[PDB]
């Protein structure tokens, strides 16, 4: 039987599939971080990791419904192993931080790439996407600054994981 | 600062963190198995094999909360490409029945080591672990049974389909 | 057309048809000590005995859904007629205990069997099974430990009647 | 102690007791069939038949109720294995009506022996049974027309079975 | 009059009765470490101790009330007195945490000796404090890690109280 | 860090520190009586007692909360081992009244004390012992009478049990 072709042009099937890659990609990055936290006794940061990793996982997957309603394959190829050595909590959300912003620069170039070829249908479609990247983006910034603010001397780490642990609780 | 060792033997962590890969491998082949459903117009088996890998996901997310609650660290691979190519709906529910099995057997596994090294803890957490891919193998098999039944003569896939996508709807 | 394989082993299949049998076994017996007990003005020991009876047929068929499920062939056996001639109200529960006793031994094991050959999902299915016998046990304990403790001599059998019916009532 | 002498006829005491048996014998077929049905793919004739098996062993336990109260013995006969060999969904249904046509025979013989020797404390407790097996009946006569009208080649094993599954639910 | 006999084995029976000790001892520990606390100005950890000193009470009565249904005497021994004499708060949790490893330890024995004698009442009787003492163990463990990332300088003992206090307020 | 001094005087803490200490060794006694009781066949008297030693446990923790909210250390000795051997009902129900009437004493004397060294609170404080204190005695005092009052001829021990199972039963 004949399915109907691709609704979606090659260079956004392509970004797409991309993004669907980079998204699982933070997922186990996220994991990764939550589980250094964990094992150093910072579960506040940890649960708020681990929640954010489960977060960007949804991302992929509203991505992947997108690609499935227009009859393009997800075509994935391998996640790559996140980074798994950290120097402390700081350095983590220096990192993570810095993530962040790279995602927030991928989807403004999959957008940008809708507005060239005037596929407007996915332009729509990542309204959402773009507003809460922004929020995740503007949230790690905000933590980071709580962080560098606090500092790890006397307490510092204690006070920072119970901050964290607060955001954490609060977004559930 | 010092930080508690972890809770759980070597052997034990080695297999929970195979699993927990394991289980991030199959929920990504299911999301392949999915999508070439969904391109090929069987919509039904797209959705079932969809919300079925977004629940292996779910799985690990739980061997990875078991992990970080007994300070041991998780050990996030690199997660295989999955297959893209697969010739039919019976050839993807053969496969899928078999990866069941399979999935069945290294569950069975850990049980039986947690036996042999008296940790009852892990014994008694994995029982969810057991019930639901039991209920998820006999799933597949009842699934495996329907498509052979109807066959894929004459509007025998659409029927296939359809009985599919009535188990999908039913279970969420 | 083709239906798949039975999904337990060859040891389990006879372990658990052989129990499904034991349980159908088990509900004649205690049909026929309810009567036993009606015939000789013994309501309330009829009462519990035919609710009793009634039970262990409710587990026969929960057996027999496993075995469903799994794709097995439900063997039943040929039974012989249950003893119909007893002597007493306390010959009746010293066999019943010793029948209950018996059947705890036969779940044991099954359930250690299911251990050696690594079936957690039968393991797993069988601890509603486990808990309820233990119940039963018990109860059948504290029944002729009652009977016992009243005796046979002016009122005695009307005082354990009556208490019989008390727990047959209370169990509704 | 002296009990009351029973309250029915011999006559009427031997035709109660074969028919508890012939329910009990009736509930062990039911099972065999459903079983053949559940591992030959067709869940939904599984789950008719174990229902109906579940109902005859009822109708067996309210013929015990009504011997109890009268002060007759129960007389349980041993159990012959069920036979376990078929040749398929049709042959099935067809062995069933001809057991529903005896059993309804047998409940009308019942009936007019209570009658001749003018038991109508038996007559009119019978009622409920002689209206509920012309309701079995009618229903086995209804499934096996619909499975020859329906057949068993092009997909017609599998309506069948769906037709056979929507009456099971609906009943429950 | 006779009783019955003992429904568990003397081997069980002596580990169980042994674990009632344990469980009572526990207790004792635990108020001995409360009231510590609280004649050094800790009355965070002094309820956290004191509430968790109850609960092991409450266990200790969960294991009589199964010994008392199997018929097994209950034999109990002394109390050991609890260590009273302790250097500080970290200390304290260090013990109590080495404490809970020992806990957890001797349940492991008694699930891994009904294994190997077929016990399997006892053994899924066991579970609730299998999966509860698990819970406790975790907790200990997140306590003493949270005191050492605190400290004991710049107010360390007022914030770990506060903190401990946090979780015996959320437990109730 | 400076902690305050314990805010009542040495006497007081001495009686109240033994009085802790003879409720605990109460509460295990009444544990052993309580067992000898379900081992005997007798667990209206068994559930009793059963209570009543968790009662016991209540009253010294209440003792403990009010050491600890005083800045008084408690002191924890070992727990004595309970008598083991008892003749039967009525001489647990005598022995047990007697010891009733000994903790009665026991309370008169802490708060004579009370009153002599001027120290009202304490006074206060024991009021609600002195009544729950009584309250037992006299029940105790119910019980022993009624027990002698049926007797241990034919059914009486039965009897006696199902009247003390009432009492049980209702104060829950
Ligand atoms: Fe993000
Ligand atoms: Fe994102
Ligand atoms: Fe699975
Ligand atoms: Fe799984
Ligand atoms: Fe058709
Ligand atoms: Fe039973
Ligand atoms: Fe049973
Ligand atoms: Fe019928
Ligand atoms: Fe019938
Ligand atoms: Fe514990
Ligand atoms: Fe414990
Ligand atoms: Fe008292
Ligand atoms: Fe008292």
Redesign the interface.
């Given at each position: 039987?004949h399915?109907q072709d691709?609704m979606l042009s090659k260079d956004i099937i392509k970004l797409l599939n991309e993004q669907v890659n980079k998204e699982?990609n933070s997922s186990?990055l996220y994991?990764?971080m939550?589980?250094?936290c964990?094992?150093?006794?910072?579960?506040g940061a940890?649960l708020f990791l681990?929640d954010h990793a489960?977060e960007e996982?949804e991302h992929a997957?509203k991505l992947?419904?997108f690609?499935?309603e227009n009859?393009?394959?997800?075509?994935?190829?391998?996640?790559?192993?996140?980074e798994?050595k950290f120097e402390g909590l700081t350095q983590i959300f220096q990192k993570a931080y810095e993530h962040e912003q790279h995602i927030s620069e991928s989807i403004n170039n999959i957008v940008d790439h809708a507005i060239k070829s005037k596929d407007h249908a996915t332009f729509n479609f990542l309204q959402w996407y773009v507003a809460e990247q922004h929020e995740e983006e503007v949230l790690f910034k905000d933590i980071l600054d709580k962080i560098e603010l606090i500092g790890n001397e006397?307490?510092g780490?204690?006070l920072a994981?119970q901050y964290v642990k607060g955001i954490a609780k609060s977004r559930k």
């Open positions: 039987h399915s691709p699982m186990n994991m990764s939550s589980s250094w964990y094992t150093h006794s910072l579960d940890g681990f489960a996982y997957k992947i419904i690609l499935n009859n393009v394959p997800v075509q994935l190829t391998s996640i790559s192993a996140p798994h006397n307490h780490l204690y994981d």
